[PDB]
Every structure is written in C-alpha cells, then in structure tokens.
Design a protein around this motif. Sequence first.
Motif, mmCIF file in Angstrom:
data_model
loop_
_atom_site.group_PDB
_atom_site.id
_atom_site.type_symbol
_atom_site.label_atom_id
_atom_site.label_comp_id
_atom_site.label_asym_id
_atom_site.label_seq_id
_atom_site.Cartn_x
_atom_site.Cartn_y
_atom_site.Cartn_z
ATOM 1 N N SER A 68 -3.843 13.215 -4.489
ATOM 2 C CA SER A 68 -2.948 12.176 -5.004
ATOM 3 C C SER A 68 -2.729 11.088 -3.966
ATOM 4 C CB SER A 68 -1.609 12.773 -5.419
ATOM 5 O OG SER A 68 -1.798 13.770 -6.399
ATOM 6 N N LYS A 69 -2.425 11.496 -2.727
ATOM 7 C CA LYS A 69 -2.222 10.556 -1.630
ATOM 8 C C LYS A 69 -3.450 9.685 -1.401
ATOM 9 C CE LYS A 69 0.225 11.058 2.793
ATOM 10 N NZ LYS A 69 0.752 12.190 3.600
ATOM 11 N N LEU A 70 -4.655 10.255 -1.515
ATOM 12 C CA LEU A 70 -5.847 9.480 -1.189
ATOM 13 C C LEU A 70 -6.127 8.400 -2.218
ATOM 14 C CD1 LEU A 70 -8.245 8.986 0.784
ATOM 15 C CD2 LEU A 70 -9.540 10.622 -0.534
ATOM 16 N N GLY A 71 -5.947 8.695 -3.504
ATOM 17 C CA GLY A 71 -6.233 7.692 -4.515
ATOM 18 C C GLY A 71 -5.476 6.406 -4.270
ATOM 19 N N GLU A 72 -4.246 6.522 -3.778
ATOM 20 C CA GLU A 72 -3.473 5.348 -3.428
ATOM 21 C C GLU A 72 -3.794 4.841 -2.038
ATOM 22 O OE1 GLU A 72 0.463 7.218 -4.203
ATOM 23 O OE2 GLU A 72 0.714 7.158 -2.021
ATOM 24 N N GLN A 73 -4.299 5.682 -1.142
ATOM 25 C CA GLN A 73 -4.806 5.113 0.104
ATOM 26 C C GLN A 73 -6.032 4.264 -0.180
ATOM 27 O OE1 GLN A 73 -5.267 7.860 3.334
ATOM 28 N NE2 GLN A 73 -3.133 8.511 3.203
ATOM 29 N N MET A 74 -6.917 4.751 -1.034
ATOM 30 C CA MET A 74 -8.087 3.955 -1.361
ATOM 31 C C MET A 74 -7.673 2.692 -2.089
ATOM 32 S SD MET A 74 -10.303 5.568 0.169
ATOM 33 C CE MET A 74 -11.471 4.245 -0.225
ATOM 34 N N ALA A 75 -6.688 2.810 -2.973
ATOM 35 C CA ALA A 75 -6.234 1.668 -3.759
ATOM 36 C C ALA A 75 -5.621 0.597 -2.870
ATOM 37 C CB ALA A 75 -5.228 2.132 -4.814
ATOM 38 N N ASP A 76 -4.792 1.012 -1.914
ATOM 39 C CA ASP A 76 -4.276 0.085 -0.919
ATOM 40 C C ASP A 76 -5.413 -0.544 -0.122
ATOM 41 O OD1 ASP A 76 -1.713 0.430 -1.771
ATOM 42 O OD2 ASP A 76 -1.078 1.760 -0.108
ATOM 43 N N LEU A 77 -6.396 0.262 0.289
ATOM 44 C CA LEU A 77 -7.489 -0.251 1.113
ATOM 45 C C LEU A 77 -8.260 -1.372 0.409
ATOM 46 C CD1 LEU A 77 -9.356 -0.030 3.574
ATOM 47 C CD2 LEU A 77 -10.596 1.728 2.387
ATOM 48 N N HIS A 78 -8.464 -1.262 -0.904
ATOM 49 C CA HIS A 78 -9.150 -2.341 -1.610
ATOM 50 C C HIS A 78 -8.250 -3.556 -1.818
ATOM 51 C CE1 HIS A 78 -11.595 1.198 -3.518
ATOM 52 N NE2 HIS A 78 -11.954 0.968 -2.268
ATOM 53 N N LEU A 79 -6.932 -3.365 -1.802
ATOM 54 C CA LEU A 79 -5.972 -4.446 -1.955
ATOM 55 C C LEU A 79 -5.464 -4.979 -0.622
ATOM 56 C CD1 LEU A 79 -3.828 -2.708 -4.738
ATOM 57 C CD2 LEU A 79 -5.445 -4.588 -5.226
ATOM 58 N N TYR A 80 -5.882 -4.386 0.496
ATOM 59 C CA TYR A 80 -5.426 -4.846 1.802
ATOM 60 C C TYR A 80 -5.869 -6.280 2.062
ATOM 61 C CZ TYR A 80 -4.935 -5.172 6.857
ATOM 62 O OH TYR A 80 -4.617 -5.583 8.141
ATOM 63 N N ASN A 81 -7.167 -6.560 1.926
ATOM 64 C CA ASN A 81 -7.654 -7.916 2.167
ATOM 65 C C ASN A 81 -7.027 -8.919 1.210
ATOM 66 O OD1 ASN A 81 -9.735 -9.770 3.537
ATOM 67 N ND2 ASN A 81 -10.229 -10.056 1.357
ATOM 68 N N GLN A 82 -6.553 -8.457 0.055
ATOM 69 C CA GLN A 82 -5.913 -9.378 -0.871
ATOM 70 C C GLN A 82 -4.489 -9.690 -0.430
ATOM 71 O OE1 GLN A 82 -5.763 -9.177 -5.639
ATOM 72 N NE2 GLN A 82 -3.759 -9.004 -4.615
ATOM 73 N N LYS A 83 -3.750 -8.677 0.023
ATOM 74 C CA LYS A 83 -2.447 -8.954 0.597
ATOM 75 C C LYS A 83 -2.563 -9.886 1.793
ATOM 76 C CE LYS A 83 -0.636 -4.391 -0.679
ATOM 77 N NZ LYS A 83 0.531 -3.441 -0.580
ATOM 78 N N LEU A 84 -3.726 -9.890 2.471
ATOM 79 C CA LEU A 84 -3.937 -10.784 3.613
ATOM 80 C C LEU A 84 -4.116 -12.237 3.173
ATOM 81 C CD1 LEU A 84 -6.333 -8.889 6.049
ATOM 82 C CD2 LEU A 84 -3.852 -9.205 6.251
ATOM 83 N N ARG A 85 -4.896 -12.468 2.113
ATOM 84 C CA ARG A 85 -5.022 -13.815 1.565
ATOM 85 C C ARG A 85 -3.666 -14.366 1.150
ATOM 86 N N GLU A 86 -2.837 -13.536 0.514
ATOM 87 C CA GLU A 86 -1.535 -14.010 0.057
ATOM 88 C C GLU A 86 -0.626 -14.329 1.234
ATOM 89 O OE1 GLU A 86 -0.477 -10.778 -2.479
ATOM 90 O OE2 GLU A 86 -2.040 -11.275 -3.958
ATOM 91 N N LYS A 87 -0.774 -13.595 2.328
ATOM 92 C CA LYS A 87 -0.002 -13.965 3.537
ATOM 93 C C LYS A 87 -0.444 -15.355 3.989
ATOM 94 C CE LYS A 87 0.630 -9.174 5.111
ATOM 95 N NZ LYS A 87 0.065 -8.123 5.990
ATOM 96 N N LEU A 88 -1.749 -15.621 4.007
ATOM 97 C CA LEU A 88 -2.261 -16.921 4.518
ATOM 98 C C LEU A 88 -1.834 -18.056 3.589
ATOM 99 C CD1 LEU A 88 -5.835 -16.340 5.962
ATOM 100 C CD2 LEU A 88 -3.652 -16.665 7.124
#
Length: 302
Positions: free
Chosen positions: A103-123
């Motif tokens: 369960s924990k990993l599915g959301e770790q993977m999900a965060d990992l694919h959305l990490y670079n997107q949270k970075l664009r929104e910061k910029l």
Amino acid sequence: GHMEQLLRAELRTATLRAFGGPGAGCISEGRAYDTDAGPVFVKVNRRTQARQMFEGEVASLEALRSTGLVRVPRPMKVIDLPGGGAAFVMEHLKMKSLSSQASKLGEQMADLHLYNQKLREKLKEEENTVPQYVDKFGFHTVTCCGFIPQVNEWQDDWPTFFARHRLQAQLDLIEKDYADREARELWSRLQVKIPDLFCGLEIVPALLHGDLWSGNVAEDDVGPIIYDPASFYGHSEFELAIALMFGGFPRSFFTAYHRKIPKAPGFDQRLLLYQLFNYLNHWNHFGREYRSPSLGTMRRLL
C-alpha cells in the motif's frame, strides 16, 4: 589487485568478510560483505559494457534517492576488474518480499511520478513572484534496460521519444539478429498509428524507475524498497506496463497508485504500446520465445 583486494582498497576496510547467498534472496546477482563501516552488497559483471551499465544504475539510483519519496539502495563505488568488466558496491539492506508495504509503495510510486510536476508548479509561483523542472523526455545519461546501451536523448514529445528511442531501438536489433519479416511489416504499419493513442491527454514528464517488476521491489521493517532502476523521464503509465506483465504485485499496490494517478482515458490501449516495448526487449535478451507476444501485440493494436 583482484576483486576482494580492490574492494578493500576503495572501501577502506580490512574486514570484507562475506555472508548471505545469491543476491541476498531478492537481487538477481550479488553478494553481501560485512566491512569495517557496516554492510555492503556487491554486484559483479564481466562484460565489456559493465561499467556503463553500472554507471547508468548509479545515475538512476542517484536521481530517485534525491527526491526523498522512495527508498533505493545508496550507490557507493564502481570498481573496474582486471578480468574484464566492473563491480558495483552499494549499501546493503535486509529485504523481505513486498507484502505489507505494498500500500505504501503504490503511493510512493505515485508521488515519484508527480514529483517533477510539483516542481513545475513551484517554478510557476517562483516566476510570478515579484529543485529544477525537466520540460523534456529522456535522461542526462545512458541508462540500460538490460545489456542494451539505450539512448535517452532529450525529445520534447513523448510519442516521438518512445517510438524512436524505445521501440525502434529494439526492432532494429531484432531486424539485425533475426531478420524477422512479420516484425518490420507490422512496425511500419504501427508507427503511423502511435500518435492516435495519446490524443485528449496532457503528459508532464514523470521520473520513472524504468524496470519496476515484482522482482525489483521489496520491503523492510521501515517500508518499501525499490532497486535495479533503468531510469529516465517518461509517461507514468509506462512504469506499470512491466509491473503488470509478470504480476507479483498485490492489488494493494494499484489501489494506492490509482488513488493518486487514476487510469486516464486510453489507459488500456497505451498499456499495450508499453508492454510492446518490454516484449521486444525480452525477445532481444531471451530469444524467439517472445516473438509470439511481440507480434500478437502489434497485431492487436492495429
């Protein structure tokens, strides 16, 4: 110096006493050594392209570890061996098979694919204001999916990147080694239909493990561990294609993952385009045995 004496020189230990078995029960290759500064795992490969293959893995390990979202083994050293090839020293974790922490990993993977997107929104907020988004697909270096030195040259459009630097990569060596007629004919027909599978969809480059099947994923007392990356920036649905193929994943894992990234329209047809890469790549690594799935897949798409 040979392997053990060279490991002693670069790790600064006099101990290097060994323990464990083949890949400590989870990793395909490798042995665990207890040194003066705690435990390490060592992978050996005596092919010529070993260092590069291992240098690709360290880049992958370096890039996932720097997002804080997933736990991967820390790279340590890459030693050239006198009898050809290289050894890759890394932090040693004790590993069980992925059960409770799925369960924990599915959301770790999900965060990992959305990490670079949270970075664009910061910029975006940063730009309007009166740690670096990747706007392209690819990778700053050659990471390998197996022993095939891949090309991760930055392309701006994902269907473009994938078709030329993933699918065509494999069907080229399939043409050279097997001279398969049904392959080239089918590929010429498929290549034109690929753009029609990504319509009605916006793709934000997502940092991918690159080979996330049930045998490259474990768990700990702390939580889930992934290992053996073949990393690049791509489409998050690609990450799941190899994960489904050899299904050792619990439904836990996808119940979590799709809570954050739910299946988009066109999921089930692009699934085939991504499993197609893995079938081709396995044809090239393991024999004509994967011809029946590879062709039956391009047949299926058209």
